[PDB]
Amino acid sequence: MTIEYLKKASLTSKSDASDVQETVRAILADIEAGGDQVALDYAAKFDRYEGSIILSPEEIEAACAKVPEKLKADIRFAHDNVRRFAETQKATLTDVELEVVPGVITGQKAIPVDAAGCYVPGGRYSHIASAIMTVTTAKVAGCKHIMACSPPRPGVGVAPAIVYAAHICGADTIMAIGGVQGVASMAFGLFGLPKAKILVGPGNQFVAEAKRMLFGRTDSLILADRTADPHIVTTDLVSQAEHGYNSPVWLVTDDRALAEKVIEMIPSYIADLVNRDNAAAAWRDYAEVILCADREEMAATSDRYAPEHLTVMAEDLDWWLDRLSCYGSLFLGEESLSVHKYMKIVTWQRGTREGYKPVAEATARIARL
Amino acid sequence: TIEYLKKASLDASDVQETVRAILADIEAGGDQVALDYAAKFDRYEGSIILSPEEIEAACAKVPEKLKADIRFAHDNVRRFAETQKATLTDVELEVVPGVITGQKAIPVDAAGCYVPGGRYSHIASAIMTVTTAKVAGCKHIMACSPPRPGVGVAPAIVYAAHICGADTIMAIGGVQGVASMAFGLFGLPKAKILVGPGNQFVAEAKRMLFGRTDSLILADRTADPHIVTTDLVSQAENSPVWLVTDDRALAEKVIEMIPSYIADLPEVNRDNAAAAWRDYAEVILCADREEMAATSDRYAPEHLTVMAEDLDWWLDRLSCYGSLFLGEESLSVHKYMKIVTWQRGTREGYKPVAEATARIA
Amino acid sequence: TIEYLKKASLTSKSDASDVQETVRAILADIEAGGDQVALDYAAKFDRYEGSIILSPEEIEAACAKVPEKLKADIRFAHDNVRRFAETQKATLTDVELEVVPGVITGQKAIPVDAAGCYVPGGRYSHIASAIMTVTTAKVAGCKHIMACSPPRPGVGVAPAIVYAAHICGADTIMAIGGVQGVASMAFGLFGLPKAKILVGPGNQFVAEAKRMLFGRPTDSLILADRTADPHIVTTDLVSQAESPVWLVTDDRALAEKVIEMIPSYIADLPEVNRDNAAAAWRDYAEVILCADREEMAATSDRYAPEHLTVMAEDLDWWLDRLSCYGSLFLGEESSVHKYMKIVTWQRGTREGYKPVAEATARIARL
Amino acid sequence: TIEYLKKASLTSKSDASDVQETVRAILADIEAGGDQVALDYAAKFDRYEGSIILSPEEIEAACAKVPEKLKADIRFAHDNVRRFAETQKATLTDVELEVVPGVITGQKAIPVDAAGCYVPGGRYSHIASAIMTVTTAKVAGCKHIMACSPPRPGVGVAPAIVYAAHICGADTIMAIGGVQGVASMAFGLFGLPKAKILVGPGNQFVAEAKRMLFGRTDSLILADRTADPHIVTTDLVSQAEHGYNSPVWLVTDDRALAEKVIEMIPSYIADLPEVNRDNAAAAWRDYAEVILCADREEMAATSDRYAPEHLTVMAEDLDWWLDRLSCYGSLFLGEESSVHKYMKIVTWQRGTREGYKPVAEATARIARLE
């Protein structure tokens, strides 16, 4: 009503926004609409640094050059410890295969995520340790692309020790951007970067908020090629109308005939289930069918979709088990701060019982993971 | 190089990404965008806020067998809730000689109750959430339910919501409905809590808005600007700060004083302090104490210090805070209640046993 | 062939292998021997020759030695802790829920008969401990509170601890420490009741004795008077071999009637069930003959059954009387928290069908 | 005023009041009586007229009565569980870390001396449990594995349980059940080793017996002729400071040192403040022991047998002590400073800080210490 701002905060007011989140959402939405440029605008405004956002190799050399050899020696020693510890941890996450029942093989794998973003608030000693842990653990984890960002100091750039640590510990990209804009830049794959799948590293409450919002918190997908039995594919897609209030489902195939025949068969099958308004509604709100050219196309699609439930009804099940990388529970065949943080745990199973072994069954129940 | 042979209406990659798109769009757009998404997803050609007439007609459509069923479940939930709420009396405790700490349960201004349909589980849910929110004492209860085309909100839901105390019955579902309650669209208050089951979209748009610090000093003409300035300056020990006053004079004197105090610190402290004051602190002028307190509550600060006359009035009136320090000196009703803690006074002597006893809890 | 150039008065080999082993030894000796052996172990370990249970006079004389600055301090802390506790205890009401028409479930918080509070000494933290536990045990509503603290030779219990224990509600103040003290409360020595819960910090021996005696189910009991249908008790009793089971009755006839009926009901079970059931009946089941309803109730309570079924007249009486059990089913048809048993009861059968009321009742718990 | 129309086989009253009471009674009886009292309970409750520890003859005879289908089943279960276990065990290699320059902390998993495995009978789930537990303990590296199952009258242990136990790696198969069987493994009766761990499902009696015996800080200093009497005496006195109820041991092979330490103790109790002086004098009297051994081997053997939570070694040939000592909690070398359930995790460290390096410190601190 009245209120008169005798001061006014240059980033947490009202007449700027009401709440930390109102700001954070506003900013993320702005950056998401705008892209590289709106990110850059926020960076300029908040960080006040007019050097490049992604450090060029020369800048890295110049940064590393400013680090006393004593501090470098220290950093390599801390690095040594962390990476040795992490590779220990990583040995415990070996692939498993268990014939739970004769004829049925269940497995697990630890898969590294594509890209990790590591936020570093600055160049303090605690921050250098932070940067080492995060970049080193993410590297040993096997992430294909690691970004380290730190809010620059004006005219100074990224704290030089942060640059050194990031570099020796395995960071693919070193970024001069902080806070909400920085987090978004990694999250959204701005500036030609890949989309960070995990984002680790301490930060102030704006940074913590965008992160809870962006990375905090059941899809189903069926991969089928021309050999898939159109009856079974349509049956499965229909049974996604039991727990299918929500529950998106995708069909990824390389065969036109199959897909069109399935959209075809839906009216006959939806009809033959209380349920059968549900099912129909679900189908055209959530279900999606995608045509592919070759099998690699299907697999890459599947991966970028990272489905919670994955069924493979195609030839060469061995290939599909080898290739596919992002899923929750994979069923092959119609007849069906620590390294851990940077990894998917994926579970798969193939086959159907080719006999009966009650002792072995019960032993499996008792065992599990 | 991929082809969509069949597409789903609900074009984005992921639920969170989609939810954000809708939320951000609606936040800028207001009622009209909310309605737009209502049109698209809800597929229903009626008003969003049900009129007394619409309520009456819906009420008329529920068999008397079901009405009595709903009234009986309501009776049960109400005596149970009223029982619990009787256990939440203000307590104030002379913890150590001279320092009195207290606790209060205060009901939040507005609750949103989501009701996904008219199956018995949903009707139960609606009674549960709306009855409890009512008993807790929420000043405004919104019940919204996904409307079905031509039919509206399941008439049983209307009956339940209405008898159980809902102030607003809304024919809007999913992200648009959640947004409508959260942001105070259609003249409604901004829902502080949102309860009730929902699809994964409803749950996500809810984690964002309600899932997950700030400090304030309330001062009037009697506050001594030295203590106020020290107290605010020591906020560089990040985290926003407010000074809320009704005294034009006081405000400007403190605003004059800060850099002189910033100079008193060791050099690790001084850069941080200057930046913190620069970036996060804000000073606000109000007409009278009533004004000030209302401002304070709308800010709901984690730390609240009161440097004003008539502390008794301040303790009674102030409602939304984390910890209140008065003076320059120092499924269940619980869900709908914020627990506030206040402290008054300073140590009066030293009592080892009482202190050691306090240490535990 | 190893030589002990110095031995521990306690944790030595040839005196025992392990703390746990020593604790077992003492508890066993005390449990068999009783009062005198407890006393002898007190003599051995505390080395103090005043009364074990302080007389009222000893209490007053102990109180008199507490500087009044400290008395007032203790009184003040006690006031806060009581004022805090009564808040929580007000949160433990009696409930009643019509889960389905005709079937009413309950809960109650019941205070245990006797609670024991250990106090390891007389420092300020120890005093706070005593104030905490004795005060809470009183607010909770335990009929008998025993506080013991290890005596200091010639001195007795720390005067501050006597004052705290007394004003906070302790019914008994005991000058005994360690395993012998814990056992004295646990085993109801010296005319004291058997402590149901034991709270309070202590050395490794005290903690071990508490782990064994008070640390930590699907036992079963049926109360029947002559009205119970013998077929029904027989079925329910065998149904535990599907874990101790008791039939507690006051009508001799029923008991004998059911005993003879048992084997035919064992026979008319599938083939895996029959041997297991026969074994269980002889090995885990008991039939106990009582005088009247009263005796049965007292029996049920002393056994503290997890599952309790009442097949008698005046189900309201049993709901009123029976107060040590887990889950009560009446009829053939069917912080302060530490000091209390939570009992849940139900009566009745469906007398109707209210789908909403039922769904909401489902939520009230789940 | 009660009359017992039917009594349960030692579940009744004036037998006992309680499950816990019965278990304590039976356990106390067995600790006193030994083998013979254990046997008494066995005969009484189990009512089985054969031997307790199966001979190779009885084992092979038992094996012979198992249908070849079930043998195949069990072998398939064993093979799965074994391969899985050895995968997990490969992850448990000894690790060594220079957390700070000059300060080396390590971790290792030690297999326990003896695992006892309870098997309640011969039902399918029970066979899975037996395979599961005995195989896991075998892979873990238990030097001695005891399997016991209650014998059935005239038959003995279910031949199936004997088969699983034997192929899965069991060193001893026991025809004894319930409390008496838990007791027999736990107390090392019948010439058997004392079971350090006890795994396996069982009735209320068995579960309480194993809660009693296995449910839920001691200190030891190993010193040889080279240790500093002042250092030892101060640590032992400072073990009567914040841990004066916690037992303390001095294990040495040099009489001279020990005698000197004992003579120094009271003068050191004298030179500290009086809140301390009574507590310490008491603590030394009540909890401290000084044990003289013939040689260092006797020392390490004592140490392991005592299995101390805190262990400090003030002797020469520190590398040897690190290699030799097996059962401790935290080992401090030098005067300066799933297979899992079947294994002790021991942490050791040697050296002192021995430079600075602020980053390594900060990294070690965030690393949650240890």
Residue numbers in the entry:
A (entry chain C): 1 to 217, 227 to 282, 285 to 347, 374 to 406
B (entry chain D): 2 to 11, 16 to 217, 227 to 251, 255 to 347, 374 to 404
C (entry chain A): 2 to 217, 226 to 251, 256 to 347, 375 to 406
D (entry chain B): 2 to 217, 227 to 347, 375 to 407
Question: Which sentences did the original study use to describe this structure?
Answer:
Dihydroxypropanesulfonate (DHPS), a globally abundant organosulfur compound, serves as an ecologically important currency for nutrient and energy transfer from phytoplankton to bacteria in the ocean. R-DHPS is also a substrate for the dehydrogenase HpsN. All three dehydrogenases generate stable hydrogen bonds between the chirality-center hydroxyls of DHPS and highly conserved residues, and HpsP also form coordinate–covalent bonds between the chirality-center hydroxyls and Zn2+, which determines the mechanistic basis of strict stereoselectivity.
Each RpHpsN monomer contains two smaller domains (domains: C and D) and two large domains (domains: A and B) harboring Rossmann-like folds. Sequence-based functional prediction suggested that RpHpsN belongs to the aldehyde dehydrogenase (ALDH) superfamily and is a metalloenzyme containing a Zn2+-binding region. RpHpsN recovered 60% and 88% of native enzymatic activities after addition of Zn2+ and Mn2+ to metal-chelated reaction mixtures, respectively, demonstrating that RpHpsN is a metal-dependent enzyme. Residue His320 from RpHpsN is conserved in l-histidinol dehydrogenase (His327) from E. coli MC1061, where it functions as a general base participating in catalysis, implying a potentially similar function for His320 in RpHpsN. Mutagenesis His320Ala of RpHpsN was conducted and completely abolished enzymatic activity toward R-DHPS, indicating the essential catalytical function of His320 for R-DHPS catalyzation.
